[model samples]
Structure formats: C-alpha cells, structure tokens
Target: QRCGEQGSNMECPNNLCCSQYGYCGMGGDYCGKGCQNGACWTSKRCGSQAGGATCPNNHCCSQYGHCGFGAEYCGAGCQGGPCRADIKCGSQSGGKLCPNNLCCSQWGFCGLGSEFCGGGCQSGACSTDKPCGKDAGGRVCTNNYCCSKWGSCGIGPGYCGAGCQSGGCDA
Candidate 1:
C-alpha cells in the first residue's frame, strides 16, 4: 500500500512533501524529515539561518515539537511571552517588561537602580542641590555636580576640578 494509504495523506503542493502524520512540509528541507510513532506531530518549514521570523498565526511549539520557520524550541509552552528578535524564539524574558537588557525596578519604573532619581541614571556624585547624570557611582566632587558616566544631565560642559592652591585660576 502507498504511504498515504495508511492515514498519511498529508499532502503538500509542488516542491513540498506531506508528512507521515498528515502535515504539509517544505520539500528538500531537514526540518520536517524526522518523525516517530504515535507522537504529537507539528508542521515545519525551511527558513533563513539568520532567524527572526514570525511564526504562523503567532503559534509556536517547543523544540520537542516541530519548529516552524523563524521559530525556536522553548523548553516550556509558548504562554504568550514576548518573541525574541535576537534568537528568533518566543522568549519569556523579552519585550517592554525588560528593555535594553535591564529589568523594571520594584517601584514600577525602568531604571538602573532601585531609586527613581533619574531616567537611565544608575549612580553618580552630585552636590546636595544639583542633579547628577546617569549611572554614576564612584564619582568625586568637593562642590560642583559630578554627573555619572552613563547618564546625561543638562547642557553644561565643564572640566573636572580636582585641587588648587593660593594662586590665580589659570586655564
């Protein structure tokens, strides 16, 4: 009897193949070539090696199941997590919840630290009155505001003043 006679009638169009479990698959591709007995079957397609393609109908499955083009084999279920553009997987640790490789603080704000002093500002040295830059931790200043290295303060370009003696302030 033909392979399709035993309920394997999954037929694909030209340049495609019908999987043993009745799923249309791309022809000459290694993605949908493997199959086992009585296991849950899924459809797959050949995609670019660079990754980053939206799954069909936004439906994705784990690696144990069939991984469509631009999809990944996440360990668990999809669970409606954010899709990772970097690896082309539906990642649980991506999207607005975690932006620019940083997670949101407990205070409901996206920042470098726990405090909400400034945006994108982690640590810095500043006067008791003036505001400092972002991500400034080990800064030193006797009086003026010392902005952090990673953050951006107002448009006030100045040099770092260390020490001076009883003499005229010469540039």
Candidate 2:
C-alpha cells in the first residue's frame, strides 16, 4: 500500500488509497495520514486527507512526525521497545549503554563480559548450574591464563589475581 500527494487520484495500490496527507490506506489497512514536511497529517473523514491526525496503535511518528514503524523511535515516550544507537543491538536506555557483548550491570549501566561477570571478558563464564567463581569462571582462567574477580575467585571483593593452587580460588 502507498499514499501519494493530495488530489493526485492515486488510489492506494493493493486495497490502498491516498488520504489527504498523502498516506495510503482506508481503515484497517492504514490509519491516520503520514507526516509531511514536519507534521503528521490526519484524515477528516475515515478516508479523507487532513494534516495533524492522531496516529493509531502499532504506528509511530517517522523522522519529522511522519508516522511509520513502531520500532523506529528510540527515546522516551516511544511506544515499542527501547531504541538502540547501533540499531542492531536492539534497545538501550541511558548513555554508555553497551552493545553486542555488553550488558547492564548492578550499577544499572552496561558492561562487557559474560551475562553474569562485568568488564571485558569472554562469554559463557557463568550459568545457573556452574555459577561464576566456581566452574565456568575457573574454566575461563585455565584456558585463557587470566584471572578476574567476582567469578571463579574466592579472594576478597574485587581481587582478581592469577595461579589457582589449593584453596587459592579455582573451583
């Protein structure tokens, strides 16, 4: 379906027709006229063109109030999921939100690491059965020859050293 300019006689293709604002649709197909220039166009009649119309559910204001996909908007007052700067990373709220391998930490911010441990680390270091600092965390250190706090280390808080001897953290 497509919408054309006003008085263009362009019936919305595929059971679609241009509304006053240039959006294509009738009722169930398309609702509210699309945005033009910098404003959302509305329909006076069920199928007539009228700028500044209220957008129905599942549709969101495009670049300049041109109602389009609900997944486009990426800020407060958005309808669907949160908008992400990467677009592919999905949704992220505050600044410095992590993308790809980053996740929200206890500090309510994004970090790199497995879903459990924070900071830049490999994935799959923690699981329900084998929690961090126990199995998965230790496995990572053994394979990569590195150490990290939180996971696989019984040392005091935030103390990630190396070498796992007896009782030296490495389970």
Candidate 3:
C-alpha cells in the first residue's frame, strides 16, 4: 500500500519496498552488499546482511539493528537501526504522557528527570517538575545535585549552603 525511496528504508517499505538499482520494487538486495543500513544491529541480533527490515513501527533502529521503544534501544548506544523518535516510557504502546513541562526518562517513565527540561524527554503533562538543582522554565535541581535552604536550585553556599531551595543548608 506504500513505497520507499532514497533512504535506508529502501530495504523494506511500508506496504512496499525500494529496489537495489532504486525503485519501489519487491525483493532483497543481496548475497553481496556492504549493508551499512543496520550494522549496529550485530549486538542486538536485529540486522540483515541480505536486505530485509523487521523493526516495530516508529521504533529507532540501533547501531546493531535491534528493535524496541526505549532508551536501551534508542539512546546513543542504539545499535544502528530504527528506534522510537520520542520517549516510550513503560509499555508506552499508547505513546507519550509526560506533560510538556515535565521530562520523560529513557525507561519510559515520566513526570520528573533531567531530560524533562531538555531534549530526549518527550512524554506528556506539560507541567514543571524538576529534580532539585535545575534552572529553566521555572525549574529546579535534583536532591543528589545539591539543593539549599530556600527551595530553588544552584551550587556553592548561595544555593547549596545556607539559603538553597528545598533541603536544609545545615551541611
């Protein structure tokens, strides 16, 4: 029902697939092709030296060519195949959930993490829930990072010592 072209997606199309020479055809590309499309898949056992794709929909392809929808398969360590573009925390079959303001972790969990106010964090909520020492969109930082007396986020004595935000400056 569909066709692919010009991309690594050439191997397997949606309802169709691109051919070797370059055309929406129906078949594989070799008993002799360099096959760089999913070289990273070696470790994950999800690659095709001959030319066939079989990853879950919207899933990021690791460097080794594994299939899944999480940081384990989508993070930088990604084997080399197709992986999910957004965070699919927990059985995220339904998709994102962390509010636009909050962040989602690679594990598929949402609400609060370093990724929230940053990239890679794509879920739902759209609320503000920082760790304990952040600094953005009215954010904060993580307890481990070092918070202060008042209840904000920073370092040194100002935010980590006497008048920080959240924890006690009694350290």
Candidate 1 lDDT for residue 21: 49
In Å, residue 170's CA in model 2 sits off its true spot by 27
Model 2 quality (TM-score): 0.18
Tell me the RMSD of model 3 versus the true structure. Answer: 14.3
Which of the numbered candidates is closest to the native, going by highest lDDT? 3
Clashing pairs in 2: 3-24, 12-16, 12-17, 20-49, 42-50, 42-53, 62-66, 112-119, 133-151, 133-152
Model 2 scores a C-alpha lDDT of: 0.35
Query: Better model by TM-score, 2 or 3?
Result: 3
- lDDT digits (tens) for residues 59-150 of candidate 3: 44555566555677777755333333443443454553432223455456554545543454444332343344333333444323346554
Q: Could you give the candidate ranking by TM-score, starting with the highest? A: 3, 2, 1
Tens-place lDDT per residue, model 1, 86-160, is 222112323234322222333333333434234332222211223233234533322223333323222123332
Against the reference, the lDDT scores of all candidates come to 0.31, 0.35, 0.42
Model 1 ranges with Cα > 4 A deviation: 1-42, 45-50, 64-171
- TM-score to native of every candidate shown: 0.18, 0.18, 0.24
Error of 2 at 34 (Å): 21
How many clashes show up per model?
Answer: 8, 10, 54
What order do candidates take by lDDT, descending?
3, 2, 1
Q: Find the 10 residues in a row with the least total lDDT in model 3.
A: 30-39
